[PDB]
């Protein structure tokens, strides 16, 4: 039948999860942002559409920092992106507190990953409406 796209964790007959795919549409509809990996670091940059002359220039910042070595930028539903960073920040604080060493990038990636994947497991939550580019420099 149909309706496989109305509840978040439901598998459609072809093995897909339409709500996540619709979340992607929200992402593609957003500002463009990128990340370039260099020989000893990473660069983040994003497009900030000027709706009007009323927007105080340089004020509505988008790039977000996690801990002191991670940078995060995203496209899509901005509020969702902040939510995801708030989580990443806790995730990082928790890691440092137990292991002392600030969180390795890969480790941090999975923290964000598992949390996001979690929102595709239940119909009582909505998937994140953002694709996020993040990174930093760590032990190696």
């Amino acid at each position: 039948g149909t309706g496989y796209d109305l509840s978040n964790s439901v598998f459609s007959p072809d093995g897909r999860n339409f709500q996540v795919e619709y979340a992607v549409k929200a992402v593609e509809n957003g500002t463009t942002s990128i990340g370039i990996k260099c020989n000893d670091g990473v660069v983040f940059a994003v497009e900030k559409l000027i709706t009007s002359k009323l927007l105080v220039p340089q004020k509505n910042v988008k790039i977000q920092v996690v801990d002191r070595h991670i940078g995060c930028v995203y496209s899509g539903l901005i509020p969702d992106g902040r939510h995801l960073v708030n989580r990443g920040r806790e995730e990082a604080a928790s890691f440092k507190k137990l292991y002392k060493t600030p969180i390795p990038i890969p480790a941090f990636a999975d923290r964000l990953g598992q949390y996001v994947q979690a929102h595709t497991l239940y119909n009582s939550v909505r998937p994140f409406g953002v694709s996020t580019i993040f990174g930093g420099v760590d032990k190696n």
Binding site: V61, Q64, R89, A93, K97
Partner: protein, 233 residues
Amino acid sequence: TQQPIVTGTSVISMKYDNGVIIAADNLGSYGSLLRFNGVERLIPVGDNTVVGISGDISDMQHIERLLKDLVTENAYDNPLADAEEALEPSYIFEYLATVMYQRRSKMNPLWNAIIVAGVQSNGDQFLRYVNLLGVTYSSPTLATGFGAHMANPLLRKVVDRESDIPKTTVQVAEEAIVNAMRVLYYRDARSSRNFSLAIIDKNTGLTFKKNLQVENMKWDFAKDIKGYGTQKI
């Protein structure tokens, strides 16, 4: 409720015309055993505040971690983190004081005596104390533990009241503090010769001096003292 195991002794400080000075030896005592000697008990936060901690070292290390986090957190979504919206000494203190009182109020204190020294953004000198009971107070000079009994009397001879601050120079001040550290070395049995000293000046910024030593000690007269009353040789 607990009891302190590894401890740090006095933390002395005072304020002069352009800033504040704070010092603390580098000893980590374990009862009467002078166990550790590379213990820094002056916690710098940013470039306008220095936190001197005495008491339980394990709790001090915890307070240290709290402070590093306060810095990290303040930097989040804060484009003025290194300017208008940087951590002020008064912010750092009110935070720690809040924590100290909440802990004593839950009957599980952080066994310390803390002195937050620094210079506010408007140039004002900041010097306030907080301990395990959550008690707080300010004075032109402040010392914890033994320094309260021996350092304050000496330091108060330089700055007895408020009006004496502008009249006091970095040199006069640093001298008083360095002499106090020597006195404490003479009579405090849980003190070390090595110590750190930090100056926070509204012009020169934060100067953190490590590995200082008490010098110019008088010990010669000891030779002339024999017996405990009637002995002559």
